[PDB]
């Protein structure tokens, strides 16, 4: 595989691992309450802190994906959990990506740290629950009866993550209004993930081909569930944020927001997975 | 904590993450069979492959420590598993160390990859069992009844690892006979671990102080068990190596080697932990 081989070759060359209070820390249009009348009841100070929390939550989701889904899948790959993989080159490519992911986690932790320092406020990760994708991944894991099912669940969710993260990062990478340290952090992350998507795509194709029919089917079901979870707005995390901020009538509004917005995707660009499933000739079966 | 703070400050500056067939790939004196009469029954080719396997095994032990012990402890630290820690600076220091460890894992995987390429042989990690420290860590975990016990077990083993790894790396870092890519890989790793030892020491001191008396005691017992395991020769891994190479009479000799050498430490420099336990004024109680 020449894709794998060259990524391995030039990693040392491309890998990323080598303030204006006026600017919002985040995009208003990615806050669920921004689309509800309650937004007008809020003070400029509260609006500002909700933007800060938004950024913090976006960082937390990214860290949680890397630590609970992506890296655990990479480790299972290296440990031989899946048929159709193996060989020294893949091991090196994956070992490199694990470094990248850990560095991405650091970048996002620092993104939040800078916000906390500059705004002079805690915005603690401890306030936030498990992100929506983390939750759904864990629910699927808990329904597994066999080890092979858990490992395929994680692969499916990680494939979705690695192939769709570019579109999640795109949401802030291009935004010229928000804090530039925030956009630049997201852009830099975005660079690495282009190459990760290629690796993850290749690996998925090969595992799928080498799996028996029952296990193939189980894997695609996990890919489906993962994408659904990945692209959704995290209503639950935002509910934790607005409760902690003491927004009056947050609960009633939250119910109304789930009703009105339960159907919109935060991430609308699904071209990564669409294209992967097309190249695999399995797009036939989907939700 | 100024130690923590400056390590955080200058990480971007110090972090490492930014062939002669004639030369042995490893040190003969770290092969258990080197000290037994069977060594004279072996061909130069077999002696050479055992040196290669030695290096490969040493890389595998290092990877297994990073992936099963060190990074899992760092993640528990960040997730608030232990009293007496917390705060943004520690989180950044630890997030940085996790990048380092993952990079060390890559360096050691590449160390083995180069050996496999240049010697034109598989020396597969799949032949090697769990390393001795990995085994003992896992045995202690399996005896735990409560979550808090598992997290303290991992902390204790990780503290030992982070504070003692310099002495394990020293064994090859200075060796001017072995392959220079091998020595240089180990030296480069060694650079980072000086700073890791400081972090890990600080964290241990503070957790211990904040723990109740029963939990303090449990933690030190785990430190003790960890050091014992960490410094021992891995007789079991070497047994897998010599069996796979088809050394005649390996089994009888292996028994004799455990008898004669069961008492020697591969790692004789225990100054890291000795000094930590002295500064904590708990050296009183030991094995
Ligand atoms: Fe990433
Ligand atoms: Fe990635
Ligand atoms: Fe290390
Ligand atoms: Fe370390």
Swiss-Prot record, chains A, B:
InterPro entries attached to this UniProt entry: AurF/CmlI, RNR-like
Its EC number(s): 1.14.99.67
Gene Ontology terms for molecular function: metal ion binding; oxidoreductase activity
Catalytic reaction(s) noted: alpha-N-dichloroacetyl-p-aminophenylserinol + AH2 + 2 O2 = chloramphenicol + A + 2 H2O
This protein's UniProt keywords: Antibiotic biosynthesis, Iron, Metal-binding, Oxidoreductase
Class of enzymatic activity (EC top level): oxidoreductase
This protein's pathway: Antibiotic biosynthesis
Keyword Cell cycle: no
GO biological process: antibiotic biosynthetic process
Cofactor: Fe(2+)
UniProt-annotated binding residues for Fe cation 1: 66, 101, 104, 189, 193
Entry binding sites for Fe cation 2: 101, 162, 193, 196
Listed Pfam families: AurF
Cofactor note: Contains a nonheme dinuclear iron cluster that stabilizes a peroxo intermediate.
Function: Involved in chloramphenicol biosynthesis. Catalyzes the six-electron oxidation of an aryl-amine precursor of chloramphenicol (NH2-CAM) to yield the aryl-nitro group of chloramphenicol (CAM). During catalysis, upon exposure of the diferrous cluster to O(2), ClmI forms an exceptionally long-lived peroxo intermediate (CmlI-peroxo), which reacts with NH2-CAM to form CAM.
UniProt record similarity statement: Belongs to the AurF N-oxygenase family.
UniProt name for this protein: Alpha-N-dichloroacetyl-p-aminophenylserinol N-oxygenase
Species of provenance: Streptomyces venezuelae (strain ATCC 10712 / CBS 650.69 / DSM 40230 / JCM 4526 / NBRC 13096 / PD 04745)
